[PDB]
Curated annotation (Swiss-Prot), chain A:
Interval of the full protein contained in this chain: 150 to 467 of 469
Originating organism: Saccharomyces cerevisiae (strain ATCC 204508 / S288c)
Lineage, broadest ranks: Eukaryota, Fungi, Dikarya, Ascomycota, Saccharomycotina
Gene Ontology biological-process annotations: mRNA splicing, via spliceosome; spliceosomal complex assembly; spliceosomal snRNP assembly
Gene for this chain: PRP3
GO cellular component: nucleus; spliceosomal complex; U4 snRNP; U4/U6 snRNP; U4/U6 x U5 tri-snRNP complex
Subcellular location: Nucleus
Annotated function: Participates in pre-mRNA splicing. Part of the U4/U5/U6 tri-snRNP complex, one of the building blocks of the spliceosome.
Name this polypeptide is given: U4/U6 small nuclear ribonucleoprotein PRP3
Keywords (A to Z) from UniProt: mRNA processing, mRNA splicing, Nucleus, Spliceosome
Any further remark recorded for this protein: Present with 432 molecules/cell in log phase SD medium.
Curated annotation (Swiss-Prot), chain C:
Keywords: mRNA processing, mRNA splicing, Nucleus, Repeat, Spliceosome, WD repeat
Name of the gene encoding the protein in the UniProt record: PRP4
Intracellular or extracellular location(s): Nucleus
Stated role: Involved in RNA splicing. Is required for the association of U4/U6 snRNP with U5 snRNP in an early step of spliceosome assembly.
Protein name: U4/U6 small nuclear ribonucleoprotein PRP4
Protein's UniProt keywords contain Repeat: yes
Segment of the intact protein contained: 109 to 465 of 465
Quaternary structure and interacting proteins, as annotated: Component of the U4/U6-U5 tri-snRNP complex composed of the U4, U6 and U5 snRNAs and at least PRP3, PRP4, PRP6, PRP8, PRP18, PRP31, PRP38, SNU13, SNU23, SNU66, SNU114, SPP381, SMB1, SMD1, SMD2, SMD3, SMX2, SMX3, LSM2, LSM3, LSM4, LSM5, LSM6, LSM7, LSM8, BRR2 and DIB1.
Biological process (GO), any one: spliceosomal complex assembly
Additional information: Present with 1770 molecules/cell in log phase SD medium.
From Swiss-Prot, chain D:
Function: Component of LSm protein complexes, which are involved in RNA processing and may function in a chaperone-like manner. Component of the cytoplasmic LSM1-LSM7 complex which is involved in mRNA degradation by activating the decapping step. Together with PAT1, the LSM1-LSM7 complex binds to osmotic stress-activated mRNAs to attenuate the osmotic stress response, probably by limiting ribosome access to the mRNA and consequently translation. Component of the nuclear LSM2-LSM8 complex, which is involved in spliceosome assembly.
Species of origin: Saccharomyces cerevisiae (strain ATCC 204508 / S288c) (Baker's yeast)
Protein name in the entry: LSM complex subunit LSM2
Gene: LSM2
A single GO molecular function term of this UniProt record: RNA binding
Recorded GO CC terms: catalytic step 2 spliceosome; cytoplasm; Lsm1-7-Pat1 complex; nucleolus; nucleus; P-body; precatalytic spliceosome; sno(s)RNA-containing ribonucleoprotein complex
Domain of life, source organism: Eukaryota
Family indicated by similarity: Belongs to the snRNP Sm proteins family.
Curated annotation (Swiss-Prot), chain G:
Self-association state and partner proteins as the record states: Component of the heptameric LSM2-LSM8 complex that forms a seven-membered ring structure with a donut shape; an RNA strand can pass through the hole in the center of the ring structure. The LSm subunits are arranged in the order LSM8, LSM2, LSM3, LSM6, LSM5, LSM7 and LSM4. Component of the spliceosome U4/U6-U5 tri-snRNP complex composed of the U4, U6 and U5 snRNAs and at least PRP3, PRP4, PRP6, PRP8, PRP18, PRP31, PRP38, SNU13, SNU23, SNU66, SNU114, SPP381, SMB1, SMD1, SMD2, SMD3, SMX2, SMX3, LSM2, LSM3, LSM4, LSM5, LSM6, LSM7, LSM8, BRR2 and DIB1.
General remark: Present with 1440 molecules/cell in log phase SD medium.
Keyword tRNA processing: yes
Residues of the full protein shown: 4 to 67 of 109
Species: Saccharomyces cerevisiae (strain ATCC 204508 / S288c)
Protein name as catalogued: LSM2-LSM8 complex subunit LSM8
Residue ranges of every copy of the Sm domain listed in the record: 1-64
Length: 318, 250, 357, 90, 124, 77, 64
């Protein structure tokens, strides 16, 4: 039976009357006939509602031939991106000068109509020898040195501490911030690629992790593991670009690699394998809920999978 | 071979070549080997008799080398003895076999434009060549040259600009641009352009030479001489510069 | 909603309906006949052959034209000469197969040429638009010289994108960066329509070859199929995301095909009342500039050029990249196909016209 | 056949497997069969006390009945496809 | 409302992007502001892409630049706001024309290229 | 029929009880003829009586496969 | 499958508790292991020269 099946398949191969490598052409007649019947007019859906009717010199009544329409022009909801107004160098300087000045003034007041802190003398190892406000400066030489060096360290340490604090707070913000930002995406750039092979782990890993990083809605489908396959990547433009770069410049799909298994570590020489960008467009809506890498046993299956997002077309048989 | 040529001893040269040939049979998978020698042999043959080459080309080039230079040589030979269509065919074949060689494409273009008077075909060919390999600036340069050769100068300029955008450093493009400028459409934005070229090409040997030539054309001769000297300093091994210098001196 | 009227339109509208209807009926009959006499094998084979031919087209002749780039390339009805508008405001014409000029006409338009169309009555009185902001009919003579203009037609305010001739020959539709698309009276050179149906300009038109339906492709991505007779629409904007820079029908009224800025050519309007796309096609990496078909005269074959430096061809049943056409060096802004044969003439930013054979 | 298929689809996967008798082992899944057995390559440590008394055992064969879970992450497993499959079946 | 002849006008996001690019170029000295400077750039060939102001009144004083670009095959937009453009450039005074110039070794080459591509897309 | 009935609460939160006093809460993403379950966004709660006093042990796992031998009850919380 | 495990020493752990080092010489579809040269893992106690281990008992098997 198996042999028979094989034979049949072979027969089909040589000359297919319709085959799904390239989606079938042939137009069915029965359907057309049915459509015609439905129409009942010898014309089409568009014209059918003039329905064999004639008034005066051919005219109609159900849809009027007198009036000119001026229908409602649907205004698209444009996303108000409040503009990054920039500053001149001079402007920036002025801003810096004034805020800082104000701060200084405050400090002065909050230390002269205030005495809320005190201002000490900023020693260093070059001052050291010349400061006398703090005592012991020759009296206790090494004590003095310790004090001054210590002070310096504190200053430096304080600076470093401040930096650390900043780092911490930024980190704290960022996690929260990402979570907060569930902004409504207006338009999605997409790029769909296809590759002859990817029996390498590394490439697959790259595809995964990068996608995860970049909120990259999409997938990577393929046939029979070793066989050819497609990537569809979608998101913000920059991310897409990055992905493309990774695909084309960073990765070498013509590299020789190793497969690690229980039986033995298999060398895979693939000079034949290559990669091409098919599409690089803008999709009206991104129906890809995440990045759903897959494999399929067959082409039909792959097609079906693709059409789970109501979009087969991304694939290109060659 | 060179020595022989200098001396001029035809039969002797032939004998030498024959001797070399016998030895040659051991040299399988040798670097810059027969491919070089065979070209030289062809040239020698051409220096006297044309047809006799062709058989060798048919035989030897086909087997081991499969190299563009041979095709070019063949084309040249054909040109020398008329047979234009045949030459064109040969060129086409070469292109089909080796897409990645601008020279062949250029030759084809020339044949299209100069020999028969249909530039459009030549242009098309050039375009095709360019498409086949956008790695090389050479194709672009060739195209520019072709454009220059015919009346159309704006187009040429545009092409040059495009080339620059794609590969800014390539001295030949700069040279072409300079040449275009020298035509005297602007006769201005000239010095600035030259400066720009110099900057981009890090005072490229050839750019300097081109500048000198332009100045020569304009007939400001001391300046031209200076430019030529500069070019020489940058790299004396290059030729046309010397010629230009000589001309200036004259 | 907001419905006044005019008398000229009324006079014409009835005629349009009659003409459209009869022709439509004929087309339907033809279609019926086709299904009745076709077979799985031979037709399929023929199609395959055609596809192969399309694929193995290569760039025959690239003839330069103009200072600025070549907005429009339009092959005559006769299919003998091609007309090539450049951005300068000049519309040279070339004997297609050799591709050598007849004349130049800079003093025609001052602005950027839009589209050129040829008149479908073989009597060659081509129309052309511009950003200039006026269309011009040109009685073309092979012998006399080149072109003589017949009439100018000031209707739009802003710059025009595209004119077409309604397959009758009695009307010329023109769409512009103004909000409207406007159908003209071929004889008297006076307007009738003005569909204020888009929030931004109508960037492209396309009549259906039966003569019933005109798709106005807008800069909004609102492709509106207007029954001209009715002033009533059977639309989907749900095709495109960026602007619809072109639209064109499979001559078999069966299909509309809108080419986009998004690049995705959307081919829709079908017997299917649900109006779903048999497919969307991924046309060009950058944007799509022109979309064409060619079943007048031969078989139906989608062909499009883009701002990607590639023309390409699609099977009108499958919708697939049947073959890329490397040939241009730079952007390709327009294109036409030889009615009878395999012989594309396309132009653009390379500032040349180019043939494919 | 759904579940088997799913298992197969997870070929070459570092996954933790908790058994009935307090044995938690990590490993790279290789072979999958009708009764849902797991052969794991490169056995690594998960916990200190629960992980059994092994060391040089780099390849194992887990009996399908004795597994409690097969501890996947949220980036290592199918879901609504499985649901669809279930729906299709009776 | 913006001028019809100022074409192609950008869109909002696109405009923003372009201004960002301009700013970057300004910091890196890879930009030139001003109609005349834009013209100069065009003449040279150094112009990667030209940015004009739609809200230039009287618009005419730009509307050679587009022509020049067309004849040199440099992409170009108008943005809407000349004030904004000026600010981007780094000039309090309101500016109409700027040119992001060419330089292979820019950090911002890639970014610039993106913007150029976008501009080209607009043109038709 | 019972299997069919469980097709309603797919892709929503569920409450699953196993043998050995192991409460599993997540969202139902899979089942079949033998009732093998795959939970996403899950969290395990292990009741374990030791030293004559009650003590729960929480194992947090963002996904988990469950074999049908262990399963007792499926419901919603 | 236990076809790679035949003619090789293997570490086999049961459901109840014990762990056995021995040479696997036969398997079937029900996981009944035919074993030779039997030994215990922890105790190092020689049970016998040959035995059969029922598939219900096998919790884990390991190649070594």
């Amino acid at each position: 039976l198996l042999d028979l099946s094989k034979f049949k398949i072979y027969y089909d191969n040589n000359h297919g009357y319709e085959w799904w490598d390239t989606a079938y052409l042939d137009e069915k007649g029965e359907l057309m006939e049915k459509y015609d019947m439905n129409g009942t007019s010898p014309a089409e859906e568009k014209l059918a509602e003039d329905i064999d009717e004639v008034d005066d010199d051919d005219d109609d009544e159900h849809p009027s031939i007198r009036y000119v329409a001026h229908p409602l022009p649907e205004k698209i909801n444009e996303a108000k991106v409040s503009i990054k107004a920039y500053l001149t160098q001079h402007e920036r300087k002025r801003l810096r000068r004034n805020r800082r000045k104000m701060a200084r003034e405050a400090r002065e007041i909050k230390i002269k109509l205030g005495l809320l802190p005190k201002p000490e003398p900023k020693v260093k190892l070059s001052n050291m020898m010349s400061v006398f406000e703090n005592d012991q400066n020759i009296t206790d030489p090494t004590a003095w040195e310790k004090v001054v060096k210590d002070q310096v360290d504190l200053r430096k340490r304080k600076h470093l501490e401040e930096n650390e604090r900043r780092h911490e707070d930024a980190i704290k913000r960022r996690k929260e911030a990402v979570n907060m930002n569930v902004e409504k995406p207006t338009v999605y750039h997409c790029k769909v690629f296809q590759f002859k092979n990817l029996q390498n782990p590394k490439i697959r890993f790259k595809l995964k992790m990068n996608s995860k990083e970049l909120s990259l809605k999409g997938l990577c489908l393929r046939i029979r593991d070793d066989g050819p396959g497609i990537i569809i990547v979608v998101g913000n433009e920059k991310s897409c670009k990055f992905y493309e770069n990774l695909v084309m410049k960073r990765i070498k799909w013509n590299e020789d690699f190793e497969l690690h298994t229980n039986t033995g570590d298999i060398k895979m020489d693939m000079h034949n394998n290559s990669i091409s960008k098919t599409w690089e467009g803008y999709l009206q809506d991104c129906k890809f809920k995440g990045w759903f890498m897959k494999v399929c046993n067959d082409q039909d299956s792959l097609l079906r999978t693709l059409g789970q997002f109501d979009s087969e077309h991304f694939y290109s048989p060659v | 071979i060179k020595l022989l040529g200098r001396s001029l001893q035809l039969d002797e040269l032939r004998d030498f070549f024959q001797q070399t040939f016998s030895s040659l049979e051991d040299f399988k998978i040798s670097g810059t080997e027969r491919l070089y020698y065979k070209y030289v042999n062809f040239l020698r043959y051409q220096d006297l008799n044309e047809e006799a080459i062709k058989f060798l080309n048919e035989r030897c080039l086909k087997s081991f080398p499969i190299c563009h230079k041979f095709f070019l040589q063949l084309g040249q030979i054909y040109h020398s003895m008329g047979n234009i269509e045949m030459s064109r065919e040969t060129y086409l074949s070469g292109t089909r076999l080796v897409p990645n060689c601008p020279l062949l494409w250029v030759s084809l273009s020339k044949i299209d434009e100069i020999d028969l008077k249909n530039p459009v075909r030549a242009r098309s060919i050039l375009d095709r060549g360019l498409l086949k390999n956008p790695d090389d600036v050479l194709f672009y340069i060739a195209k520019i040259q072709m454009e220059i050769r015919l009346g159309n100068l704006d187009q040429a300029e545009l092409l040059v600009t495009q080339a620059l955008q794609k590969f800014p450093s390539n001295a030949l493009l700069w040279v072409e641009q300079i040449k275009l400028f020298k035509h005297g459409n602007k006769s201005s934005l000239k010095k600035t352009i030259f400066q720009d070229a110099l900057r981009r090409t890090q005072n490229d040997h050839r750019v300097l030479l081109e500048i000198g030539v332009s100045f020569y054309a304009e007939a400001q001769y001391e300046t031209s001489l200076k430019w030529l000297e500069r070019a020489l300093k940058k790299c004396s091994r290059y030729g046309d510069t010397w010629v230009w210098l000589f001309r200036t001196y004259a | 909603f907001f419905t006044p009227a005019t008398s000229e339109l009324i006079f014409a509208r009835r005629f349009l309906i009659n003409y459209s209807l009869e022709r439509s009926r004929k087309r339907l009959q033809k279609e019926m006949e086709r299904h009745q006499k076709f077979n799985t094998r031979q037709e399929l084979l023929s199609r395959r052959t055609e596809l192969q031919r399309m694929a193995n087209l290569e760039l025959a002749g690239s003839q330069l034209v103009s200072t600025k780039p070549i907005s429009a390339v339009s092959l005559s009805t006769d299919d003998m000469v091609v007309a090539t508008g450049s951005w300068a405001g000049d519309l040279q014409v070339l004997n297609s197969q050799t591709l050598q000029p007849l004349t130049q006409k800079l003093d025609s338009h001052v602005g950027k040429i839009g589209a050129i169309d040829w008149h479908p009555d073989s009597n060659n009185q081509m129309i052309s638009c511009a950003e200039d902001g006026l269309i011009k009919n040109f009685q073309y003579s092979n012998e006399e010289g080149g072109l003589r203009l017949l009439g100018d037609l000031v209707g739009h305010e802003r710059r025009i994108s595209d004119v077409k001739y309604h397959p009758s020959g009695k009307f010329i539709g023109s769409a512009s960066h103004d909000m409207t698309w406007r159908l003209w009276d071929a004889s008297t050179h006076q307007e009738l329509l003005l569909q204020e149906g888009h929030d931004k300009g109508v960037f492209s038109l396309s009549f259906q070859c039966d003569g019933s339906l005109v798709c106005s492709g807008g800069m909004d991505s609102l492709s509106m199929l207007w029954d001209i007779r009715s002033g009533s629409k059977v639309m989907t904007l749900a095709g495109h995301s960026k602007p619809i820079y072109t639209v064109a029908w499979s001559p078999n009224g069966y299909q509309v095909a809108t080419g986009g800025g998004d690049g995705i050519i959307n081919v829709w309007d079908i017997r299917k009342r649900d109006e779903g796309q048999l497919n969307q096609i991924l046309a060009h990496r950058n944007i799509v500039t022109q979309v064409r078909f060619s079943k007048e005269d031969g078989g139906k074959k989608l062909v499009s050029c883009g701002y990607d430096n590639l023309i390409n061809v699609y099977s009108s049943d499958t919708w697939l990249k049947m073959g890329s056409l490397a040939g241009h060096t730079d952007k390709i802004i327009s294109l036409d196909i030889s009615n009878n044969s395999h012989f594309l003439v396309s132009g653009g930013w390379d500032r040349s016209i180019k043939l494919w054979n | 056949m759904l579940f088997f298929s799913f298992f197969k689809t997870l070929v070459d996967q570092e996954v933790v497997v908790e058994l009935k008798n307090d044995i938690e082992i990590k490993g790279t899944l290789q072979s999958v069969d009708q009764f849902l057995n797991l052969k794991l390559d490169n056995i690594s440590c998960t916990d200190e006390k629960k992980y059994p008394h092994l060391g040089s055992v780099r390849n194992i064969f887990i009996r399908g009945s004795t597994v409690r879970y097969v501890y996947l992450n949220k980036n290592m497993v199918d879901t609504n496809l499985l649901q669809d499959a279930t729906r299709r079946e009776v | 409302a913006p001028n019809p002849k100022a074409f192609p006008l950008a869109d909002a996001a696109l405009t923003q992007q372009i201004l960002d690019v301009v700013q970057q170029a300004a910091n890196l000295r890879q930009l030139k502001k001003g109609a005349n400077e834009a013209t100069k750039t065009l003449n040279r060939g150094i112009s990667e892409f030209i940015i004009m102001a739609a809200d230039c009144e009287p618009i005419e004083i730009l509307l050679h630049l587009p022509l020049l670009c067309e004849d040199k095959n440099v992409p170009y937009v108008f943005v809407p706001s000349r004030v904004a453009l000026g600010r981007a450039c780094g000039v309090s005074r309101p500016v109409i024309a700027a040119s992001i110039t060419t330089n292979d070794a820019s950090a911002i080459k890639t970014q610039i290229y993106a913007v150029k591509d976008k501009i080209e897309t607009l043109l038709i | 029929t019972p299997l069919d009935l469980l097709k309603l609460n797919l892709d929503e939160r569920v409450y699953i009880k196993l043998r050995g006093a192991r409460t599993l809460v997540g969202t139902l993403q899979a089942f079949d003829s033998h009732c093998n379950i795959v939970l996403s966004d899950a969290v395990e709660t292990i009741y374990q009586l030791n030293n004559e006093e009650l003590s729960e042990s929480e194992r947090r796992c963002e996904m988990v496969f469950i074999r049908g031998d262990t399963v007792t009850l499926i419901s919603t919380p | 499958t236990l076809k790679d495990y035949l003619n090789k020493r293997v570490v086999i752990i049961k459901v109840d508790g014990e762990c056995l080092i021995a040479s696997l010489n036969g398997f079937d579809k029900n996981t009944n292991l035919f074993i030779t040269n039997v030994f215990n893992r922890i105790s190092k106690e020689f049970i016998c020269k040959a035995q059969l281990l029922r598939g219900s008992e096998i919790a884990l098997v390991g190649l070594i």
